[PDB]
Design a protein around this ligand. Structure first.
Ligand SMILES: [Mg+2]
Ligand SMILES: [Zn+2]
Ligand SMILES: [Zn+2]
Ligand SMILES: [Zn+2]
Lengths: 550, 107, 87, 112, 171, 97, 180, 275
């Protein structure tokens, strides 16, 4: 955001999901993440050539980024990479990896069941990329022979070679984050090495894996296994750096240093005097930290808890709903130009009005563009200042730079220019979204005409009590101020209280006369009830439209 | 159409797709006692010709996938002897319009 | 493709303007008016860009066109000038 | 007939509480649970297991698992679901977003 | 070489220009941006043909801002040099390292070493020259060059050429 | 204040698409990123002022676009990449309905 | 990079690595300069290449018509050719366009055939050859005397034409040559 | 409910589709009308004795005591015996009979009060007020004016526009019930004897029914999915329940709604109703 860029501005028309190839991870990388350390080497408290590191983005408000030289706000951050000492399963694909293993010969890489098998032919025909893989799996899982030859479609007596070796297939089971096979006096039991799984996957034909759920360009099964790990830049794992002599690294920064630590342990162990049953130990550890980094809340396994004993935020857990990125940061957001206070009803507001306390009106602003129509009014609001009620808070120049009327030494001699925006106070009759949560209705959010009033409560007409499901038992409501001439039009023309009167929920109106007015209307409209002139004249005057005819 | 009492052995069942283009239907006598199509809730399903279906998709700018489906094993689908892809025009009475027509493609 | 554009003759969407098309025309025009675009109607002392836009719509002097997309991706273009505004 | 009975049963829940809901609403829910020939539940493994947008479906109940499968099967989100445009911060093809607005230079020059 | 290409630029106009001199403004902003431009993809966009019939099409109004985006379809004369392309040009500069040759909008540079042995530099000549037993190459001489390779730069395409092969050199 | 999922629903119900966008973007976390036109990631090293844009390991300095998305979405995407998932954003359609 | 220019060729380039090939006179021009082009009317149209003589007359004509449109909206021979084009440029061009002034001076100084009549007859002559647009352009742009002079400078040719056939063309081209 | 219906919207082709463009409803709520523009109205031809229906709707210009009295319209005296005209009223009535039997097929219980789109009672009311209809002097309407005027109005009640037999038959269906009500309320005897409409008044009732009807159709862009979801959901939140504190005691309200949406196989109160 914020600075000008010559790059063409378009909209995302498609999202192509896929898997990272290790090759991509390296190409796309700005730093080879080498050390678990974050800085303070040579003495200097400033990011190290290993973790975090300038190559990735800024820790400080430096202006430096090394990569783009743009600075914190503008810089999105750039990915680094860690070359892993041994391949590791991506925790989220362990079951799929097992199912791919169950479908293919764990030796020659051929898909265990050919287009020679009739049931397989039907399964292959399935157009659904996933339902096909389901049908393929159910058929191949119970195939424990990689056939050399098979009965021909013409005659089943004279068998035809379909290709592939003649190896027995293992009965695969999941034991933690490992896969163990059982071939066939007594069965042979051994763990399947991540390398071995990967090698077999690399040997699966394009035609074979595109017959499984996979994609030649975007998700080759071999990419479910990780060799080159991308390192998310600092904006994903912000170092909340308080004071000078202190920092505050993110959970992810620790888990990554753990991955790094475990990796060096493994790489130095295998390179040097490898006891080979201490190598498998460090490899299990690297598999644990790479698994537990993406998902920490793994089925029937211990949690990878912090120093504190605090479980550690998995990237998974970050996105997992109600408060995830998706449910809490994207489908929902806390928003600017919003207000909230206790509501209390008013018989002297119109149905479509909303009483806004002066303090609230004085905080919330509308960005009005200086034009020949308002130039005169707008200069008065700017003159009035951010403290008087009909006033303004900021003046935005052509330059895009904001003038703070509270402090500007030129706040009194501002001479507006067409094009500038005056961020003025919300004034009477501005359309605003008014809302009582839970928002179960179209009507739980309606557009109202502002009425700036004294006292600290939002005032509403009593007949609009029903659609909101509001009481004055101490209920609070939200106000949202639109900022575009366009979004106001949306509120006024589509969701304003009068429009919302006859609801499509029940093909009947969702507002009517209530409480005092309902009780009193029966009372007034009785045969027995009569009114003397004195009061008739007041009761007439009170009707604002009244034609002036007694 | 073979109307069987209790069962048709799987050894006999092998013979059903054995003689194409001709299609064979297996119906249990017990299911046929009541004509389900006669039920209060069962509307009228009308089998559409190749041309009739082509026109449907043309006129609503539809891909077969977009059409609401009917399972090949659906009681009414079986009754009309619906094959895969065959589209059925369902005419039900409506409390909103008087009569409403939906279409269901076979599976 | 440009088999996408449905021709003026043989067009079948409502010859009327939708509540949404009105809300977006008024908004769009008020936004344009608000950011100093030339106004095609004589403002008879008018100053609110929405009130000016409404006057523009009322005199059918809005030079916008609605591109109505069909589910297949095809479209019928309808001018603000030609659409009936019952609402 | 399943659809008919399903409507009846949904309606009878609403009608019993006295309250009235216009036919079309209950009809639409019932129609949705039925278009794909058979009874599609309004649950995690019902509607959320459709061929709809990977981003759209992750927005309800099986989020990360959904997105993992998106990568593994190289899914392509069309971006026509409200949800995707909400995630992308784009004007959704909803109501006011169902069409496009264009300036006609011809009519512009005709008005001036 | 020197092509005629069918190209299209997307211009975004601010609401203030939604007046009648719009197609007028657009067609000009097209020439502002595109004319005299230089890409690697198309080379030098030299002159926009058929100003009178430039296709503005309908302009889509961008949603949160009032501006309208037009895809202005046009057709122009372009210059794209290539390796193996034989060019006729005129000397522009000349030093101890070689001489530059102005070929249309771009310069082709001949190396001391991409010239025949017999042709050798002379510092003491006004302006400096390259002297062979028969011909002399200086600041204004016409040369036929064979483009050995091209380098794409911001708003230019520079190239290296040879006058070593037969039928290449002074003209 | 919160413009939560439920408030999103109501705006959709109203068909107020522009208001919803404003609420989610301009009134909250709207952000500008540079996308690669080839590989569709936020890889672009945009030194905007020198006017340089590059997707090294694509060698792309031509097919580059700018997009406005919620920062939370920019984040979500980097988070998915951190977990080896490629959420490739493309500015043009490839299928057609 | 910037809001650059699009083409009428549709790029299908999804993820696939930059497999872009060599540019030579093995007539391996760009993808952007393929023989089978597509004009703005969606029709397949053959590549357009210009001999300096054509190229000058095109830019001249274009700028001349532009002056006409500019004077309409306003309402409501060798060195003396160079002199005059510099004046047309002062009017129809942005002046910031140094490239076109440089181009016009080059074409005005290197054009083999001056008047349209001859540039048409040259076009009609090389038309028949059925050679690549680029080769037909070079045969107009580069003056050759030997079939070998031509076949050397335009290697692309080689076996495409007879030595004597090309020499008949090169002769006709010298005859059509304007005496500046 | 919301997350299951989000992407359902009405398209510019009057169809109801999701983000896949799969058809859900061929036209919103089988009638193609915006729920807000609907009101409970009585379909008169459905109920009562056939004798009472006959008295209400039958006109027989060939029967001295079953014609329209000249007190009803000017033409009255000269309309008696008009064979060609009796062919119009005969067809008019044959259709009113058709409607009655059809309605009885749709609403089996003989329920007449159904929410439909144009408040015809109010139009006639307003017309009478507007024109100060004198329920004394004879109308200036002709049999053809009424008979063919109503016939012509029907053709202009457009929900679907499309120059093809599929889209056109779709249109005929969508207006099948409304027309039933229309034919019911604007029958020759009703128009002349009940409402005492003049040609002016009648022509106005027609132009208004047309206008009001067109106004009543759903707007493409209508986010009809979320609408439906919320319209079922919000009433659920207002449920006391379960099924009193005691016919059959079937599980109801929130627990039965949960049971339904889950498509629960093992349900609390399974039961048949054998007739
Ligand atoms: Mg309370
Ligand atoms: Zn950076
Ligand atoms: Zn094998
Ligand atoms: Zn890239």
């Amino acid at each position: 955001g914020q600075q000008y860029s010559s790059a063409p501005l378009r909209t995302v028309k498609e999202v192509q999901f896929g898997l990272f190839s290790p090759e991509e991870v390296r190409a796309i990388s700005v730093a080879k993440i080498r050390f678990p350390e974050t800085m303070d080497e040579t003495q200097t408290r400033a990011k190290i050539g290993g973790l975090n590191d300038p190559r990735l983005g800024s820790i400080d408000r430096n202006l430096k980024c090394q990569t783009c030289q743009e600075g914190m706000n503008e810089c999105p951050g750039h990915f680094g990479h860690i070359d892993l000492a041994k391949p590791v399963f991506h925790v989220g694909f362990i079951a799929k990896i097992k199912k791919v293993c169950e479908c293919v010969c764990m030796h020659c890489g051929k898909l265990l069941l050919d287009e020679h098998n009739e049931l397989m032919r039907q399964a292959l025909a399935i157009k659904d990329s996933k339902k096909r893989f389901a049908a393929i799996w159910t058929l191949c899982k119970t195939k424990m022979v990689c056939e050399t030859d098979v009965p021909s479609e013409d005659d089943p007596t004279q068998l035809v070679s379909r290709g592939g070796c003649g190896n027995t297939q293992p009965t695969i089971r999941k034991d933690g984050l490992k896969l163990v096979g059982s071939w066939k006096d007594e069965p042979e039991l051994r763990v399947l090495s991540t390398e071995e799984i990967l090698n077999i996957f690399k040997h699966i034909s394009v035609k074979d894996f595109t017959s499984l759920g996979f994609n030649e360009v975007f998700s080759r099964p071999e990419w479910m296994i990780l060799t080159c790990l991308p390192v998310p830049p600092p904006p994903v794992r912000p170092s909340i750096s308080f004071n000078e002599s202190q920092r505050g690294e993110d959970d992810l920064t620790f888990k990554l240093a753990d991955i790094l630590k475990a990796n060096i342990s493994l790489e130095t162990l295998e390179h040097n005097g490898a006891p080979h049953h201490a190598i498998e130990e460090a490899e299990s550890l690297l598999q644990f930290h790479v698994a537990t980094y993406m998902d920490n809340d793994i089925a029937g396994q211990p949690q990878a808890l912090q120093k504190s004993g605090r479980p550690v935020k998995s990237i998974r857990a970050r996105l997992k709903g109600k408060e995830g990125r998706i449910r809490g940061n994207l489908m929902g957001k806390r928003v600017d130009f919003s207000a909230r206070t206790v509501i209390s009803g008013d018989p002297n507001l119109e149905l479509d009005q909303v009483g806004v306390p002066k303090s609230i009106a004085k905080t919330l602003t509308y960005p009005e563009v200086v034009t020949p129509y308002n130039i005169d009014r707008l200069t008065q609001l700017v003159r009035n200042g951010p403290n008087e009620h009909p006033g303004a808070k900021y003046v935005i120049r052509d330059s895009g730079d904001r003038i703070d009327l509270r402090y500007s030494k030129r706040a009194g001699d501002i001479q507006l220019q067409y094009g500038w925006k005056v961020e003025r106070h919300i004034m009477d009759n501005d359309p605003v979204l008014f809302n009582r949560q839970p928002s179960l209705h179209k009507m739980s959010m309606m557009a109202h005409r502002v009425k700036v009033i004294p006292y600290s409560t939002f005032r509403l007409n009593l007949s609009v009590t029903s659609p909101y499901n509001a009481d004055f038992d101490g209920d609070e409501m939200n106000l949202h101020v639109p900022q575009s001439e366009e979004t106001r039009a949306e509120l006024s023309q589509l969701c304003a209280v009068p429009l919302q009167i006859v609801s499509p929920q029940s093909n009947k109106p969702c507002m009517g006369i209530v409480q005092d007015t309902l009780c009193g209307i029966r009372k007034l409209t009785l045969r027995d009830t009569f009114i003397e002139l004195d009061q008739v004249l007041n009761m007439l005057y009170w009707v604002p439209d009244w034609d002036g005819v007694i | 159409i073979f109307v069987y009492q209790n069962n048709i052995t799987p050894s006999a069942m092998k013979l059903v797709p054995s003689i194409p283009p001709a299609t064979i239907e297996t119906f249990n006598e017990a299911a046929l006692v009541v004509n389900i199509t006669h039920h209060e809730l069962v509307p009228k399903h009308i089998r559409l010709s190749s041309d009739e279906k082509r026109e449907l998709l043309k006129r609503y700018r539809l891909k077969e996938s977009q059409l609401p489906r009917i399972q090949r094993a659906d009681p009414v689908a079986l009754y009309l002897g619906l094959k895969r892809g065959e589209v059925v025009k369902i005419i039900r009475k409506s409390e909103t319009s008087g009569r409403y027509a939906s279409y269901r493609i076979c599976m | 493709l440009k088999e996408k554009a449905i021709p003026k003759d043989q067009r079948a969407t409502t010859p009327y303007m939708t509540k949404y098309e009105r809300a977006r025309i008024l908004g769009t025009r008020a936004l344009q008016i608000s950011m100093n675009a030339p106004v095609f109607v004589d403002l008879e002392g008018e100053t609110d860009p929405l009130r000016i836009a409404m006057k523009e719509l009322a005199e059918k002097k809005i030079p916008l066109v609605i591109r109505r997309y069909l589910p297949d991706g095809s479209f019928e273009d309808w001018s603000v000038e030609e659409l009936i505004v019952d609402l | 007939a399943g659809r008919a009975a399903l409507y009846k049963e949904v309606y009878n829940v609403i009608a019993s509480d006295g309250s009235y809901v216009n036919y079309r609403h209950m009809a639409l829910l019932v129609d949705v649970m039925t278009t794909q020939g058979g009874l599609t539940s309004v649950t995690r493994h019902g509607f959320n297991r459709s061929n709809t947008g990977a981003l759209m479906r992750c927005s309800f109940e099986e989020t990360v698992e959904i997105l993992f499968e998106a990568g593994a099967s190289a899914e392509l989100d069309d971006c026509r679901g409200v949800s995707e445009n909400v995630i992308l911060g784009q004007m959704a093809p909803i109501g006011t977003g169902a069409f496009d607005v264009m300036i006609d230079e011809e009519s512009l020059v005709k008005y001036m | 070489m020197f092509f005629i290409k069918d190209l299209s630029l997307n211009i975004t106009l601010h609401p203030s220009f939604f007046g009648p001199r719009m197609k007028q403004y657009l067609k000009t902003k097209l020439l502002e941006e595109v004319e005299g431009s230089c890409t690697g993809k198309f080379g030098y966009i030299l002159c926009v043909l058929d100003y009178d019939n430039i296709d503005i099409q309908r302009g889509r109004i961008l949603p949160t801002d009032g501006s309208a985006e037009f895809n202005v379809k046009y057709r122009a004369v372009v210059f794209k040099p290539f390796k193996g392309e034989v060019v006729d040009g005129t000397v522009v500069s000349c030093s101890q390292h070689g001489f530059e040759v102005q070929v249309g909008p771009m310069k082709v540079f001949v190396t001391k070493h991409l010239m025949p042995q017999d042709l050798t530099f002379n510092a003491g000549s006004n302006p400096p020259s390259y002297q062979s037993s028969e011909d002399v190459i200086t600041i204004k001489s016409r040369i036929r060059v064979k483009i050995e390779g091209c380098i794409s730069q911001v708003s230019s395409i520079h190239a290296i050429g040879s006058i070593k092969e037969d039928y290449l050199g002074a003209i | 204040l919160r413009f939560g999922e439920m408030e999103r629903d109501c705006m959709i119900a109203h068909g107020a698409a522009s208001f919803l966008k404003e609420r989610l973007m301009e009134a909250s976390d709207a952000f500008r990123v540079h996308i690669c036109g080839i590989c569709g990631l936020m890889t672009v090293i945009a030194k905007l002022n020198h006017n340089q844009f590059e997707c090294k390991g694509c060698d792309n300095k031509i097919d580059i676009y700018q997009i406005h998305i919620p920062y939370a979405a920019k984040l979500l995407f980097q988070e998915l990449m951190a977990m080896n998932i490629t959420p490739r954003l493309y500015t043009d359609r490839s299928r057609d309905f | 990079m910037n809001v650059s220019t699009s083409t009428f060729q549709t790029r299908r380039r999804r993820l696939k690595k930059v497999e872009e090939e060599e540019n030579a006179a093995t007539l391996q021009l760009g993808q952007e300069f393929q023989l089978k082009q597509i004009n703005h009317q969606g029709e397949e149209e053959e590549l357009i290449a210009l001999n300096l003589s054509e190229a000058r007359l095109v830019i001249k004509e274009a700028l001349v018509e532009r002056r006409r449109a500019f004077k309409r909206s306003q309402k409501k021979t060798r060195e003396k050719e160079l002199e005059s084009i510099d004046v047309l440029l002062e009017q129809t061009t942005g002046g910031n366009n140094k490239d076109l002034k440089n181009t016009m001076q080059y074409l005005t100084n290197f054009s083999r055939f001056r008047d349209q009549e001859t540039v048409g007859a040259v076009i009609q002559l090389l038309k028949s050859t059925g050679l690549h647009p680029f080769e037909v352009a070079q045969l107009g742009s580069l003056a050759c005397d030997t079939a070998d002079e031509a076949k050397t400078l335009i290697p692309s040719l080689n076996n495409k034409i007879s030595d004597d056939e090309l020499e008949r063309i090169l002769k006709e081209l010298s005859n059509l040559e304007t005496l500046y | 409910l919301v997350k299951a219906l989000e992407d359902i919207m009405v398209h510019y082709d009057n169809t109801t589709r999701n983000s896949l463009g799969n058809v859900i409803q061929f036209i919103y709520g089988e009638d193609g009308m915006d729920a807000a523009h609907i009101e409970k109205q009585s379909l008169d031809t459905i109920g009562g004795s056939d004798a009472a229906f006959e008295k209400r709707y039958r006109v027989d210009l060939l029967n001295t005591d079953h014609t329209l009295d000249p007190s009803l319209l000017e033409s009255g005296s000269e309309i008696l015996g008009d064979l060609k005209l009796q062919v119009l009223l005969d067809e008019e009535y044959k259709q009113l009979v058709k409607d009655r039997k059809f309605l009885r097929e749709v609403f089996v219980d003989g329920e007449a009060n159904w929410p439909l789109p144009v408040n015809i009672r109010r139009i006639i009311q307003n017309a009478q007020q507007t024109f100060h209809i004198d329920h004394t002097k004879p109308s200036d309407l002709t049999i053809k004016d009424i008979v063919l005027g109503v016939k012509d109005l029907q053709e202009n009640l457009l929900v679907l526009r499309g120059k093809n037999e599929i889209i056109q038959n779709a249109q005929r269906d969508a207006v099948t019930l409304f027309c039933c009500l229309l034919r019911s309320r604007l029958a020759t005897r009703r128009v002349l004897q009940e409402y005492r409409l003049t040609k002016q008044a009648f022509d106005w009732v027609l132009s208004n029914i047309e206008a009001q009807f067109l106004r009543s159709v759903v707007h493409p862009g209508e986010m009809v999915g979320v609408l439906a979801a919320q319209s079922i959901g919000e009433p659920a939140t207002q449920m006391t329940l379960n099924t009193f504190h005691f016919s059959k005691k079937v599980t109801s309200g929130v627990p039965r709604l949960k049971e339904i949406l889950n498509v629960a196989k093992n349900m609390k109160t399974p039961s048949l109703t054998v007739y």
